[PDB]
């Protein structure tokens, strides 16, 4: 599902 490290954009 959708998730990201805080310093990265979504895919």
């Amino acid at each position, epitope marked *: *599902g*959708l*998730k990201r*490290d*805080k310093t990265k*954009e979504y895919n």
Partner: antibody
Amino acid sequence: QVQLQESGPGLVKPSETLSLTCAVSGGSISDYYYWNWIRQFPGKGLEWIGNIYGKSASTYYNPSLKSRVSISKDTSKNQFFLKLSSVTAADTAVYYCAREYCIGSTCYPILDSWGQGAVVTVSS
Amino acid sequence: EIVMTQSPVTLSLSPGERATLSCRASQSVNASLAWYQQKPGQAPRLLIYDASTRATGLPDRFSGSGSGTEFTLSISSLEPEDFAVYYCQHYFNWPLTFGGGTKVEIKR
């Protein structure tokens, strides 16, 4: 205590462009968050419109609106913006701005902090 | 898009009773499911995410469960202040979509 506040016209004529501003306090737009627009229809259904990243041009939009929506930001004013073109009565809704949720170093596209909602009617 | 459907549309229960709200996804969303509470005149408030993790400070009477296509929000003992519309939202893929809400009314 990040706070969001929508502003803009409450009445838009059919075929014209709906514009709204979200002013943010208690935090910077230029931050590691996506800033979102959501609307709630008179029947109480909720629809996600799209988002914009605080630290790049990255945007995601609902494909049902992609042809007529634009989200932008002005980090000198700490604001972000919604423009929805070619509106009709089906666009009458309460429009909310919101900041997505982060806990520690992980973020998810769910909404933590919301504005108060801007009521917009599309009518002649 | 993935479509979220909620049932029942409305619930009317006495204080102290357990409310069980259901959310169904049209395809599996695994655990990428959140719940919100919306009181009159207010924006929605995030309650639960990852199907079962409570937002910080949330009263323990709110609990989320489920996986895949079937999810539940439980309010273990209703209180008068719990009057609201409750919505689910997936975040499995784009676009994000919401269920149509369950309105919880309090008997007295």
